[PDB]
Structure 1
């Protein structure tokens, strides 16, 4: 795996962000995690949805340098969203969210599991701390 530069365009919610990647605007969805819903009327505004959103926004907006890291499997979902680990000044947004108890490990499939144990450990620790979602 390798990290590639990208530029923030807009934070959309906890786990979805719009980036400039290789000169073209693209929506990215964070690999191996799920933040709670804030947009879809089916699920409603889920608990910690706004908090996950604000955390991701601050993390990406405040960063000097954004990088995307594709995994070894499928690189886009069915909705055209790029699937990657996003880093803000070298810190993984996906891991930060899980460790903060603001996303759960989810959707681990289609070859994209390089960071699974890293993220599962973060989750176990957030759970032990009864932090946010696990409170």
Structure 2
């Protein structure tokens, strides 16, 4: 029953986080089910492939005509107040694109927020087989 809703980009913040206008409110969104290397790591700062993951997410959302967010069936925000969602740029899921490119791993999954888990895991297996980026 997952449905997509429109949103407007405000700012990409990191590989795994984008700020969007949603239902007329600015909101920070964390991409569901993926871990990217970070530029804003609480303890490490800027990890390896972090600038790259960050640039990938940025370009993909900044250059899209349409951004949509899709909540999963469980919790829609985390303990930091970030929305938890799948983000689409012109119909293409940003979460999957990162994983397919070897710029994210599939995260530890917490049910029931696991609807696209298999699909993402499939893309991660492919990126690993192609030895892309993080897997190189």
Determine if the TM-score, normalized by the shorter chain, exceeds 0.5. Answer: yes
Further displaced range: 101-110 or 66-75: 101-110
For the Cα contact (< 8 Å) 1:32–1:107, is it kept in 2? yes
Q: 1:19-62 CA distances to partner (integer Å, 9 max, x unpaired)? A: 00000000000000011121135123111000000000000000
For the Cα contact (< 8 Å) 1:74–1:110, is it kept in 2? no
Q: 1:55-114 CA distances to partner (integer Å, 9 max, x unpaired)? A: 000000000000000000110000000000000000000000000000000031041000
Residue aligning to 2:65: 64
3-state SS, counterpart of residue 94 of structure 1? helix
Q: Which runs of 5+ in 2 are unaligned?
A: none
Q: How many residue pairs end up in the alignment?
A: 135
Instruction: State how far apart, in whole Å, the 1-side matches of 2:5 and 2:108 are.
Output: 23
Further displaced range: 69-78 or 35-44: 35-44
Instruction: State how far apart, in whole Å, the 1-side matches of 2:108 and 2:68 are.
Output: 21
User: Could you list the runs of 4 or more consecutive aligned residues of structure 1 that deviate by over 3 angstroms after TM superposition?
Assistant: none
Instruction: State how far apart, in whole Å, the 2-side matches of 1:110 and 1:79 are.
Output: 19
TM-score by length of 2: 0.97
- Deviation (angstroms), 1:134: 0.3
Instruction: State how far apart, in whole Å, the 2-side matches of 1:3 and 1:107 are.
Output: 24
Instruction: State how far apart, in whole Å, the 1-side matches of 2:10 and 2:23 are.
Output: 13
Instruction: State how far apart, in whole Å, the 2-side matches of 1:41 and 1:4 are.
Output: 31
Instruction: State how far apart, in whole Å, the 2-side matches of 1:40 and 1:120 are.
Output: 24
Instruction: State how far apart, in whole Å, the 2-side matches of 1:107 and 1:59 are.
Output: 24
